[PDB]
Scaffold this active site. Structure first.
Site, PDB file in Angstrom:
ATOM      1  N   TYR A 141      -0.696 -10.267   0.338  1.00  0.00           N
ATOM      2  CA  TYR A 141       0.359  -9.709   1.223  1.00  0.00           C
ATOM      3  C   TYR A 141       0.275 -10.300   2.623  1.00  0.00           C
ATOM      4  O   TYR A 141      -0.777 -10.812   3.033  1.00  0.00           O
ATOM      5  CB  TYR A 141       0.328  -8.160   1.272  1.00  0.00           C
ATOM      6  CG  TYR A 141      -0.989  -7.540   1.763  1.00  0.00           C
ATOM      7  CD1 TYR A 141      -1.329  -7.529   3.107  1.00  0.00           C
ATOM      8  CD2 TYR A 141      -1.864  -6.982   0.857  1.00  0.00           C
ATOM      9  CE1 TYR A 141      -2.554  -6.977   3.539  1.00  0.00           C
ATOM     10  CE2 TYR A 141      -3.046  -6.430   1.242  1.00  0.00           C
ATOM     11  CZ  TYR A 141      -3.411  -6.411   2.581  1.00  0.00           C
ATOM     12  OH  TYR A 141      -4.562  -5.715   2.911  1.00  0.00           O
ATOM     13  N   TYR A 167       0.847  -1.189   0.000  1.00  0.00           N
ATOM     14  CA  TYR A 167       0.000   0.000   0.000  1.00  0.00           C
ATOM     15  C   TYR A 167       0.880   1.235   0.000  1.00  0.00           C
ATOM     16  O   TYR A 167       1.997   1.207   0.521  1.00  0.00           O
ATOM     17  CB  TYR A 167      -0.882   0.067   1.231  1.00  0.00           C
ATOM     18  CG  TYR A 167      -2.021  -0.898   1.116  1.00  0.00           C
ATOM     19  CD1 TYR A 167      -3.216  -0.539   0.465  1.00  0.00           C
ATOM     20  CD2 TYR A 167      -1.908  -2.176   1.652  1.00  0.00           C
ATOM     21  CE1 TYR A 167      -4.287  -1.433   0.354  1.00  0.00           C
ATOM     22  CE2 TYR A 167      -2.951  -3.077   1.561  1.00  0.00           C
ATOM     23  CZ  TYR A 167      -4.153  -2.704   0.914  1.00  0.00           C
ATOM     24  OH  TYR A 167      -5.203  -3.595   0.882  1.00  0.00           O
ATOM     25  N   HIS A 174     -10.541  -3.350  -1.866  1.00  0.00           N
ATOM     26  CA  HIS A 174     -11.465  -2.817  -0.864  1.00  0.00           C
ATOM     27  C   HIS A 174     -12.476  -1.919  -1.594  1.00  0.00           C
ATOM     28  O   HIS A 174     -12.099  -1.158  -2.462  1.00  0.00           O
ATOM     29  CB  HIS A 174     -10.682  -1.961   0.150  1.00  0.00           C
ATOM     30  CG  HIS A 174      -9.680  -2.731   0.974  1.00  0.00           C
ATOM     31  ND1 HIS A 174     -10.000  -3.332   2.172  1.00  0.00           N
ATOM     32  CD2 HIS A 174      -8.367  -3.002   0.765  1.00  0.00           C
ATOM     33  CE1 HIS A 174      -8.927  -3.945   2.669  1.00  0.00           C
ATOM     34  NE2 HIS A 174      -7.930  -3.759   1.830  1.00  0.00           N
ATOM     35  N   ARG A 206      -3.149 -12.382   3.284  1.00  0.00           N
ATOM     36  CA  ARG A 206      -4.423 -12.037   2.675  1.00  0.00           C
ATOM     37  C   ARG A 206      -4.397 -12.437   1.165  1.00  0.00           C
ATOM     38  O   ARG A 206      -3.378 -12.301   0.474  1.00  0.00           O
ATOM     39  CB  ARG A 206      -4.643 -10.502   2.651  1.00  0.00           C
ATOM     40  CG  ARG A 206      -4.793  -9.747   3.956  1.00  0.00           C
ATOM     41  CD  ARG A 206      -5.762 -10.420   4.869  1.00  0.00           C
ATOM     42  NE  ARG A 206      -7.064 -10.727   4.251  1.00  0.00           N
ATOM     43  CZ  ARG A 206      -7.970  -9.875   3.755  1.00  0.00           C
ATOM     44  NH1 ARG A 206      -7.774  -8.550   3.726  1.00  0.00           N
ATOM     45  NH2 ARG A 206      -9.111 -10.359   3.267  1.00  0.00           N
ATOM     46  N   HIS A 236      -6.986  -8.684  -2.968  1.00  0.00           N
ATOM     47  CA  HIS A 236      -8.308  -8.129  -2.802  1.00  0.00           C
ATOM     48  C   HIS A 236      -8.328  -6.675  -3.115  1.00  0.00           C
ATOM     49  O   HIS A 236      -7.318  -5.991  -3.095  1.00  0.00           O
ATOM     50  CB  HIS A 236      -8.842  -8.319  -1.366  1.00  0.00           C
ATOM     51  CG  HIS A 236      -7.950  -7.722  -0.301  1.00  0.00           C
ATOM     52  ND1 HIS A 236      -6.770  -8.299   0.100  1.00  0.00           N
ATOM     53  CD2 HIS A 236      -8.012  -6.521   0.322  1.00  0.00           C
ATOM     54  CE1 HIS A 236      -6.129  -7.467   0.919  1.00  0.00           C
ATOM     55  NE2 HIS A 236      -6.864  -6.375   1.061  1.00  0.00           N
TER      56      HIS A 236
END
Ligand SMILES: [Fe+3]
Ligand SMILES: [Fe+3]
Ligand SMILES: [Fe+3]
Ligand SMILES: [Fe+3]
Ligand SMILES: [O-]
Ligand SMILES: [O-]
Ligand SMILES: [O-]
Ligand SMILES: [O-]
Lengths: 202, 238, 238, 202, 238, 202, 238, 202
Positions: free
Chosen positions: B145, B106, B160, B155, B158
């Protein structure tokens, strides 16, 4: 008939991905924020602020909060408002904010909402609808903010009276203060434990 | 048509607040049951966002933060329809997305994962559904990640997403996944959802006929929000 | 025959105290585990109620509160047998019932449901099982009714029942339902019971051969209480 | 072999449907109540009273309570009593009551029970067996009431000693008081939380 | 579009005239086979009823005969769609219903069943389908009732309905039942229908998301009428 | 494609629930009945009456009958009429009646219909379409009423000629009578047995 | 115990009156439906036959008509229990039987079948059930025989039986068959019974442990009559 | 719960196997027959006779008939009679007969029964319960015999009035005749067709 898409936590970067500007990601020209007052907006300006605490009593610094409210005359800037009254044209009625990374305080600059009709001809006390998202929160938590200087209206409020443990109603009342001429309502949210804030399924 | 309240949220179709396998939920879940209320104007209204405010690249995560080159990673288009539970299209709903880049990183100082940052990728987008409830955006497929729940937790990839539609009662934030990702079966966050049919409702499906040759792949993903019921007798809302 | 203690209550055959889906249980359930004790005279004894005290219409909910006319609703007879877990009949046990009327309304100021009150219906009855453990009463079939757990929650039609029998350890209060009611599958209170076979044990069955022509329908419903074991070696009770 | 019928909550009207008379439903000529003393009943009259509190500390006003006890000589008015002693013939040994709708207090007028044999030749201290039913309570909760002026007997009581956390034994001891000549034992029940009353699986 | 005739009624999808198990049919059924005819203007036309003639409570059996109070019984909404066999909506069709009250008693001197009469319930209603073929009415759920076929015969709860639509050939009267009623499997009148799939077509389904909290339950029930075929070659109707 | 909803008998109260007014159930302001003549209605007034008999020859007193017909010029007051002619604007063309509870007679006050086009350029004789519902009748029975004073037209009627047993055609012809100036057509219906009326699948 | 009426006869559990495959029924079946009535003293009463009247060989078809020798054929004992539909024993019921001999020939001039007559066999017997509803008789196993329905029709071996018990409403005549007889599957008379489970209820079962060595085989055959229901509220019989 | 054993036809020799004596099969010492009058039996002696006809109008010569009735005071010689009245001790109340092989006539010598209570305090008219068995009859047919000289009682009879086609009630009334001093009631039974006798499901 279909089932509602299932909720999932906003996760650790929800207060970044929904407020990119603040996270120094300059992808949008027009950015959404925590300021609901435009220059011609009507009503008395107020500042709503507080902190959100987990079960150990520590403030959450990764929470994302939004509020939804009516204008000064208790009319929603929404096509679903059936009141037949004209709404203040310089009011979105919604805002979004995160908590300061260090302090943990969150805030909004808005207007004190007017009373909105309740069901079957009743009248609700002035309130702001609030939702909280964060890592560890699987579904956004809904609550409402009422005002301590509206004791009379609060006492006849349908929603507040529908809470049977009278002692919990008070967790929904923010405290009025006056910082150098500005009116501030302090509203602290306790997710778990003693004086746990009331949350609604709406 | 006079509209009444939104159908009750079916709590069995959603994760519970307290879910021990997702450790962060233990201290961030209320111990009291939620108090259900009958809806008022407050719950059936919501804000309106005008199209005028959106830029031309707001739904193009590939180019909206590109400075000297294109971001690295798999080019994908994601599109689908937003409908209410009774099948009606949801018009002019605000759909916002955020995600990691191709390395699973991120774009924030808080993310210290060794997966490399991509100077040409931002990872934020938004759009308004059209009159048929249709939405489409373009992006780079996010990488899975690691994160610390159990030390070796991972995870699945994905994206969000968040929706603000016609009523405050419809407000929803969630995450969707990509068909076939093997991490989907091991994720404690996805496993907070009780039923397998609802876990499958968050999986975006490969839409092969809609791939764009020599260009991008495409995934299909529909979203369902709570629906309002019509009133034919007493209207108590007000 | 020298009697020993009641067989241990099988906790897996009953709802747990804390059951999050029935919201009122969250603040009314102990956080400590129940402490199990070995039984004494206190637990294996219970009071006796003499038949002399009961009026002739005590088990006839149709007529026991009728003032100017008959109550409105479906005339039904409910009968069955009370036995202990080892199959022995339970004799002279006090069975008390209470319920709503045909609209799903209870006869109390506290019930504010719009379902109409019936001036000729009370909703309380009682009887003593006979020597074969048989019981029979007559009533009006209760209507299902809304209640606030989630805002649109609805209880299937039910009749509340209570039993005081031979030992205090047998004391039981529960609720039975009517075969075929579709609300049975959605009720959070019935779903507190862990197993499906035990949920079915609370469903009263249509007993068609026992309907009374041009008069009333009939439901069959048996009840099982804990049983005592016999002692053949040391008797430690005392 | 059969499985015991599963329990279900008494629900919101359990204290009405089992005490119709009090709810002004006059369907029965003979009504069951909270008075165990008849005129020739033997023993010292006492009044047992208190309140039942939920996890927030608020009293339950919809609870239904019953008690079961022995007569003045520690004999149960039950055919299952194997003591070979004659029981007081003017004593039912059982009663039922609800809590006052406003105050939240419940009470019984009874007699102080005598000591009952325990298992393997032991002697139990005087006690009253108590059960609680209410909305939110899925299975009736069993507890016992002991008396503070019977410290000596309480110290040798089998059941009380079978509670390993000695600190919890005290939640089962009622306090003796003397209101204008009448003896009253105050017994408060806390369903959840601090000083949670001990409940038994019997 | 030039319309031709209504598709032929499929006799296997309906009860036969002579059905020995429903005793009253033995003397009220023709012994000759019905004579089939080719349709003319007479069979493809029907009357029109103007909305102006209907009162505001015509589809509200709960209030349309209420004098001092509300009727006693379960408050229910019944709604659904009327379509032709080719799936086209049937617009402005006259739908009339009649039924017993909560005790299973009809409001007529001829009904001598001991089930109590309800002074605030009439049991008749009517409505016009809208442009989508939608209809909705509100009522009290009828109670099952005894009748003399075999001496102990009992009808499941039912609501009688009648439709006058676009063509005389579509004229239909029938009865619908409520999901789960156990009497449905024993009724000689419902068993005159030959196939199980058609018996199921008369069962109104619980529509839980459409219940109105603290108020009424809701049943969904769709009706299908015969459809006309379009003509593309010779039009022989005239 | 869907299957037609299956028919069921109208049952014992069909002539009450569809004619509430007559059963003294005053729920509707505007009630449907057996009178098709309004004041400006065109055509010759006639009265159609008779009885319906079961297989034992007894009249049914619980039958419900409706009729559907064309106006005086053979035009249907229906949007599906493709004749391109204007219909009498003071004519519904439909009526409903039950049989008298004692006598067993049913009746309608209407107008004698004019001839309606048949298929492929033929002409049908004047007729009234009739349907019967009652307890014991699983599907409404369709029949037609022709008139004895229209022998010439009846002889060339398509539908009547499509009945191969010429002897049965006559069961569909009503008899003209003149009661004190009023024209009455007597039409008796025999559901079963000798002289069983012809019923159609339409 | 105050007794009420007999449970309604379930017509679906019995042959219909008109059964075209059994040709003689075509002219001997009513065309009208049977008229059901509510029972009175007339239907719940029946005569009593005293044991004193029966001879010692009345239930011994092997010896009760033996003149110079024993009848020819398979020696069999048939025994079983008569109960009502609720499982109660039927005491002191009159059970009468009649049958053909081992050749399938009845002892009457009317029977002209070539199967040989047996001068030592009569073919009639009777008994009273005891207090447990038990009955037992001895006989020669009847032979199957031809009859004219279709020209080559053949009845499986059978014994005709009749019962007069406590109520006139229980009056029953029928026929039972022997386990394994292959003619059972082809008999038009047995096929008048609609369900296969009820056809099986007329088959007497081999009871091997009850054979008497070097003597006779044994068949077990139970009979069920209609049962009365008990009354606990109004007794309308009178 | 159990299903009733299914009925089957009595078959061709039912009137032989149940009346062996008449078929010259002398296996029993005491034989059941069609004579209900013993010497001290009370009441007026009557003879009941007639024929049973199939659908072609021919008499059945293989039918077996039984009757069940009350004594002269309307009391049944049955332990299930709850009238609290003593029954005539010289009356079985039941008989069995077959039809003459040639003529086809059947008969019983009995007593005219007295009136028996009906349901809910009503009074039934005098009647004899009758059942018919024969080849081709799959289940015994139940009917009742009433008497023409009891018109007044017949008019108020519950069962007769429960037959809605009044015209069929008359098939249940036997005709009184007086043959040389003896009273005879002729009762003909028509199983199928015109004037079909009413049969009951009891
Ligand atoms: Fe993420
Ligand atoms: Fe309840
Ligand atoms: Fe009906
Ligand atoms: Fe035979
Ligand atoms: O995340
Ligand atoms: O309840
Ligand atoms: O009906
Ligand atoms: O036979």
């Amino acid at each position: 008939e279909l089932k509602e898409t299932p909720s999932q936590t906003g996760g650790p970067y929800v207060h970044i991905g929904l407020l990119p500007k603040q996270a120094n990601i300059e992808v949008f020209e027009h950015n959404l924020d925590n300021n609901l007052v435009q220059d011609n907006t009507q009503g008395q300006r107020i500042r709503l602020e507080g902190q959100v605490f987990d079960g150990l009593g520590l403030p959450l610094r990764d929470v994302l909060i939004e509020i939804w409210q009516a204008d000064t005359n208790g009319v929603y800037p929404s096509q679903a408002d059936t009141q037949g009254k004209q709404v203040d044209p310089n009011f979105l009625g919604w805002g979004r904010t995160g908590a300061d990374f260090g302090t943990g305080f969150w805030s909004f600059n808005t207007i004190k909402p007017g009373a909105v009709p309740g069901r079957k001809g009743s009248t609700q006390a002035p309130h702001i609808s609030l939702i909280i998202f964060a890592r560890g929160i699987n579904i956004g938590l809904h609550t409402r903010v009422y005002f301590d200087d509206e004791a009379e209206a609060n006492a006849k409020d349908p929603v507040l009276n529908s809470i049977e443990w009278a002692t919990r109603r008070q967790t929904l009342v923010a405290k009025r203060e006056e910082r150098d001429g500005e009116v501030v309502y302090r509203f602290d949210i306790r997710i778990q434990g003693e004086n746990e804030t009331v949350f609604f399924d709406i | 048509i006079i509209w009444g309240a939104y159908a009750q949220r079916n709590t069995e179709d959603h994760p519970p607040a307290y879910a021990p396998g997702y450790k962060t939920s233990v201290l961030r879940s209320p111990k009291n049951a939620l108090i259900s209320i009958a809806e008022t104007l407050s719950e059936v209204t919501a804000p309106h966002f005008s199209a005028d405010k959106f830029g031309p690249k707001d739904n193009d995560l590939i180019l909206n933060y590109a400075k000297d080159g294109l971001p690295i990673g798999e080019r994908v288009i994601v599109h689908g329809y937003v409908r209410d539970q009774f099948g009606r299209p949801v018009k002019n709903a605000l759909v916002e997305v955020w995600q990691a880049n191709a390395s699973g990183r991120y774009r924030h100082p808080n993310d210290q994962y060794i997966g490399a940052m991509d100077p040409n990728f931002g990872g934020c987008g938004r759009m308004l559904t059209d009159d048929n409830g249709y939405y489409v955006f373009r992006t780079i497929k996010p990488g899975p990640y690691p994160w610390r729940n159990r030390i070796n937790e991972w995870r699945p990839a994905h994206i969000h997403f968040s929706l603000i539609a016609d009523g405050w009662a419809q407000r929803l934030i969630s995450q969707f996944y990509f068909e076939g990702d093997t991490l989907i079966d091991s994720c404690p966050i996805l496993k907070t959802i009780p039923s397998e049919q609802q876990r499958r409702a968050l999986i975006a499906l490969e839409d092969k006929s809609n791939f764009i040759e020599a260009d991008s792949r495409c995934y299909r993903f529909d979203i369902t929000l709570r629906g309002r019921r019509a009133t034919y007798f007493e209207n108590d809302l007000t």
